[PDB]
Amino acid sequence: SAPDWIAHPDTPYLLIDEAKLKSNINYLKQRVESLGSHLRPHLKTLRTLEAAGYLLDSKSAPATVSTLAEAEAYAKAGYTDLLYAVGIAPAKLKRVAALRQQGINLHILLDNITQAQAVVDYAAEFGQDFSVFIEIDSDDHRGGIKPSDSKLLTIAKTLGEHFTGLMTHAGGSYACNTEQGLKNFAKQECDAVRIARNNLETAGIHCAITSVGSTPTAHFGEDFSDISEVRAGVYTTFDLVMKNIGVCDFSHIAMSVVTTVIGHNKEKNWLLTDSGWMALSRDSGTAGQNRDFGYGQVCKIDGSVLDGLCVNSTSQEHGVIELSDAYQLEDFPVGHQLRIMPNHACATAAMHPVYHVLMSDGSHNTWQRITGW
Amino acid sequence: SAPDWIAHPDTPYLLIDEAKLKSNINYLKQRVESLGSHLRPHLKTLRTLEAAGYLLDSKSAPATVSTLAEAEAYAKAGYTDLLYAVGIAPAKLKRVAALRQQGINLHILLDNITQAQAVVDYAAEFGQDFSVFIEIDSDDHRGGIKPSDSKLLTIAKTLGEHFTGLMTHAGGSYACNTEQGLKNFAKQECDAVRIARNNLETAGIHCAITSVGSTPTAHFGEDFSDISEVRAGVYTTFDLVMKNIGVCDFSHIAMSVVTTVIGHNKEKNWLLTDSGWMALSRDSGTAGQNRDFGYGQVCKIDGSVLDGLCVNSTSQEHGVIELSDAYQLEDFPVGHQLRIMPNHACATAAMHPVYHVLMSDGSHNTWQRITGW
Ligand SMILES: [Cl-]
Ligand SMILES: [Cl-]
Ligand SMILES: [Cl-]
Ligand SMILES: [Cl-]
Ligand SMILES: [Cl-]
Ligand SMILES: [Cl-]
Ligand SMILES: [Cl-]
Ligand SMILES: [Cl-]
Ligand SMILES: [Cl-]
Ligand SMILES: [Cl-]
Ligand SMILES: [Cl-]
Ligand SMILES: [Cl-]
Ligand SMILES: [Zn+2]
Ligand SMILES: [Zn+2]
């Protein structure tokens, strides 16, 4: 039985299970460290100050952020080792410099000569040191330099003392759904940075840090012994996309939207809830996988899965659950409450300015999301 | 040429064109009033205090809201006639009562006997008056009572003095893409409430207010002379879904995301921007229409459409624009800026805590979004 207070806040609202959060976090930390590396957790799934305390051993422990809004918030909270892992816009260099002048080791990411020259020009004009990763393309999906591209050498040389190392994200691993496919994708990700690192060293370039990761590759890679750090973030809570990939099952999913039944359609056997896309997002990641959960798997207020029930459709402020003939409208009266598991934790969390947290001791906490850019 | 200040805020950010906002608003007001009715504008697309000033003639003018967060914010700002147009959860009645005790004519919406009994029971226990609309199903898509359902009579009678009238939203009109189809859908919407109203009056029930509307039906209905009020909201800015339906063309779209080019892929002819789904949302409404704009139509910083260019893919904090062979990467260097028009204005605006506003006099304003529930 969930605590009585789940029924207190008006719906819809986001609910994080602290006990499951902590389990998910402990599992990956122990796994990566047993494989000879360490984590640089990514803060962008949850984007709360509290999440960094669960994920990081100390204020100086390496972390990843997806925005300078995050960087500024975590720096204010005392965190001093932050990789801003999105290709840098030159106009943001003054904000990066401002953090570095406050004692924050704020690293940036780039993959082109224009960005590298902007860093060098800024450094020259303002006397500012930078710490810079070059993005490597490991999965043919996003940015980064291919390991064999001669411009890898040119760009690293241009950066000189500001060059810190190599970073890749194999987000393409999300297409996988077998253990061997995942192991292979993790090896592809690591090999891309190994090859890039070898090409750098052959050319006389020192590479202080090699950095790989996504939740799937972090959970299935077999050898991180020569990789400096592994990054992951969505594993904090998991989601249905992860369930379908096979990184977790339903029991590991620590995020849900608490929703109230606000109507019925007797003719069509529908429940209408207050969980529209404004609460869930329109992420439909599971539609491209082998089990389509619509806009989320429906659960009881105690968290247990209601077989066969999903939020099939949404508008802005309501959702529709098409009941199967195994269910009766009468058992879900207006005012009854449910929990919806998300397709994509990162996308659903973006919709909530404040999260409610079921602490492992049964108590109720709230966390404020760091929003904007 | 757009004002120089568009290049000042860090990207991505949301930009509203005030001159176009004002034009779009003036057009519908004059149209509906010429057809013998008046507007109850919906505030949920923009959810700013400033939007209500553009949309409403006075603080007492009727408006629509989608959340009690909106209701509370607009009430604090002095607005006193607010229809909360989402089927009511019984636990929210105490918040509705609190507003009504402050002098706010806060109307609620319901479609089932459970909700009606909850209102009556609250009224009896706490001595509280309510103003209640019954939702009518006009489009077979969402909630509401069919006009011929005998429970319409039962529910209205149960409400007694709290019964204010009938409300429908023909969101199904969004499937239309011809002028005659839209005219017909508007007639279907109005006829549904006319029939319901006739059934009420035959049974001896007074119906103070009849309320219809969506942006498409408001712009194409031919006869509102016997309908109390017409509701619309997305027309404030329009969007690509509306463009495809044919309610507007590109020139009327008053919302865009300003984004910076942060990378290139030479092999594939890609631009990478800082406009991911965190800035645009994953609404893909145009994919089901006759012109798929991906995650948005790409425009120059001056607002003019770049033919053939869309944000084809997104991740969390970046977007990908696949260039056609009409374009050269060189013309969009890293640091170049673009504007992205949204699929769905309501969905894109949800992603932005603050909007930047290009005032009609060329100046720069900002508006704070009212977030949460
Ligand atoms: Cl629980
Ligand atoms: Cl380059
Ligand atoms: Cl696979
Ligand atoms: Cl999606
Ligand atoms: Cl249940
Ligand atoms: Cl919608
Ligand atoms: Cl402009
Ligand atoms: Cl009923
Ligand atoms: Cl049509
Ligand atoms: Cl969509
Ligand atoms: Cl341009
Ligand atoms: Cl994504
Ligand atoms: Zn994610
Ligand atoms: Zn909308």
Instruction: Please tell me if residue A86 touches chain B, with a CB cutoff of 8 Å.
Output: yes
Q: What DSSP designation does A124 have? A: H
What H or E segment, with its residue span, contains residue A131? Answer: strand A131-135
Q: Residue A5: count other Cβ atoms within 10 Å of its Cβ.
A: 12
**How far is residue B56's CA from residue B101's CA, in Å, rounded to a whole number?**
23
- In our burial notation (b when 16+ CB lie closer than 10 A, e otherwise), range A85-100 reads bbbbbbbbbebbbebb
Please work out, in degrees rounded to the nearest 5, the angle formed at the alpha carbon of residue A216 by the alpha carbons of A210 and A220: 80
Which of B55, B53, B86 minimizes the C-alpha distance to B69?
B86
**CB half-sphere exposure, B64, CA atoms < 13 A:** 24
**How far is residue B198's CA from residue B193's CA, in Å, rounded to a whole number?**
8
Q: Which whole-number Å values give the CA distances from B263 to A14, A135, A166, A282, in the listed order?
A: 35, 11, 17, 27
Can you spell out the DSSP letters for A297-312? EEE-TTS-EEEEEEB-
CB contact under 8 A, B284 and A282: yes
Which of B153, B250, B236, B246 minimizes the C-alpha distance to B202?
B153
What H or E segment, with its residue span, contains residue B166? Answer: strand B163-167
- In our burial notation (b when 16+ CB lie closer than 10 A, e otherwise), range B3-26 reads eeebeebbbbbbbbbbebbeebbe
Q: What DSSP designation does B240 have? A: H
Which of B158, B238, B223 minimizes the C-alpha distance to B193?
B223
What is the β-pairing status of strands B313-314 and A131-135?
unpaired
Residues 6+ apart with CB under 8 A from A273: A12, A259, A260, A261, A262, A311, A318, A319, A320, A321, A338, A340
Q: Which whole-number Å values give the CA distances from A329 to A12, A325, B79, B140, B250, in the listed order?
A: 20, 10, 38, 18, 45
Partners of residue A265 on adjacent β-strands: A270
Nearest neighbour of A89 by CB, restricted to B68, B274, B281: B274
**Contacts by B25-34, CB closer than 8 A, 24 or more apart:** B25/B54, B25/B55, B25/B235, B25/B236, B28/B218, B28/B219, B28/B232, B28/B235, B31/B218, B31/B219, B32/B218, B32/B224, B32/B230
**How far is residue A239's CA from residue B266's CA, in Å, rounded to a whole number?**
35
Cβ pair A281, A257 in contact under 8 A: no
**How far is residue B287's CA from residue A67's CA, in Å, rounded to a whole number?**
29
**How far is residue A143's CA from residue A163's CA, in Å, rounded to a whole number?**
18
**How far is residue A83's CA from residue A283's CA, in Å, rounded to a whole number?**
26
What is the CATH number that goes with domain B1-17+237-373?
2.40.37.20
Q: Which of residues 242-281 of B touch A (CB under 8 A)?
A: 260, 262-265, 272, 274, 277-279, 281
Provide the experimental method for this PDB entry.
Answer: X-ray
Tokens 């100046």 label which residue?
A: B363
Helix axes of B151-159 and B179-202: crossing angle, nearest 10 degrees = 60
Cβ pair A361, A291 in contact under 8 A: no
Tokens 């959860």 label which residue?
A: B89
- In our burial notation (b when 16+ CB lie closer than 10 A, e otherwise), range A222-249 reads eebeebbbbbbbbbbbbbbbbbbbbbbe
Residues of B with Cβ-Cβ distance to A114 under 8 angstroms: 333-335
**How far is residue A55's CA from residue A57's CA, in Å, rounded to a whole number?**
7
**How far is residue A96's CA from residue A72's CA, in Å, rounded to a whole number?**
9
**How far is residue A19's CA from residue A361's CA, in Å, rounded to a whole number?**
9
**How far is residue B322's CA from residue B310's CA, in Å, rounded to a whole number?**
7
What is the β-pairing status of strands B105-110 and B81-87?
parallel
What is the β-pairing status of strands A63-65 and A81-87?
parallel
Torsional class of B238: left (φ above 0), alpha (ψ -120 to 50), beta (otherwise): left
Q: How far apart are the first and last CA of chain B?
A: 39
Q: Residue A198: count other Cβ atoms within 10 Å of its Cβ.
A: 12
Q: Which ligand is nearest to the CA of A233?
A: 13
- CA dihedral defined by A110, A116, A118, A124, rounded to 10 degrees? 130
Cβ pair B344, B283 in contact under 8 A: yes
Cβ pair B224, B180 in contact under 8 A: no
Tokens 């949302």 label which residue?
A: B281
**How far is residue A364's CA from residue B115's CA, in Å, rounded to a whole number?**
29
**How far is residue B188's CA from residue B217's CA, in Å, rounded to a whole number?**
10
- Residue B320 three-state SS: strand
**How far is residue A165's CA from residue A208's CA, in Å, rounded to a whole number?**
5
Give residue A331 CA to ligand 5 midpoint distance, Å. Answer: 7
Which of A200, A234, A184 minimizes the C-alpha distance to A66?
A234
CB contact under 8 A, A284 and B282: yes
**How far is residue B8's CA from residue B298's CA, in Å, rounded to a whole number?**
20
Residues 6+ apart with CB under 8 A from A44: A64, A65, A66, A67, A70, A233, A346, B316, B317
- Residue A59 three-state SS: coil
Tokens 């810190």 label which residue?
A: A164
Could you tell me where in chain B the CATH 2.40.37.20 domains are found? 1-17+237-373
Residues of A with Cβ-Cβ distance to B334 under 8 angstroms: 89-90, 112, 114-115
Could you tell me where in chain B the CATH 3.20.20.10 domains are found? 18-236
Which of B205, B49, B74 minimizes the C-alpha distance to B134?
B205
Query: What's domain A18-236's architecture?
Result: Alpha-Beta Barrel (3.20)
How many angstroms from the chain centroid is the CA of residue B317?
Answer: 25
**How far is residue A355's CA from residue A343's CA, in Å, rounded to a whole number?**
17
What H or E segment, with its residue span, contains residue B367? Answer: strand B364-368
Note the helical H segments in A203-288.
215-220, 240-245, 277-280
Residues of B with Cβ-Cβ distance to A46 under 8 angstroms: none
Which of B56, B359, B3, B48 minimizes the C-alpha distance to B229?
B56
What H or E segment, with its residue span, contains residue A271? Answer: strand A270-273
Q: Which whole-number Å values give the CA distances from B186 to A149, B224, B242, B287, B343, in the listed order?
A: 59, 10, 15, 24, 23
Please work out, in degrees rounded to the nearest 5, the angle formed at the alpha carbon of residue A70 by the alpha carbons of A73 and A217: 135
**How far is residue A268's CA from residue B196's CA, in Å, rounded to a whole number?**
21
Residues of A with Cβ-Cβ distance to B92 under 8 angstroms: 10
Note the helical H segments in A85-212.
93-101, 113-126, 151-159, 179-202
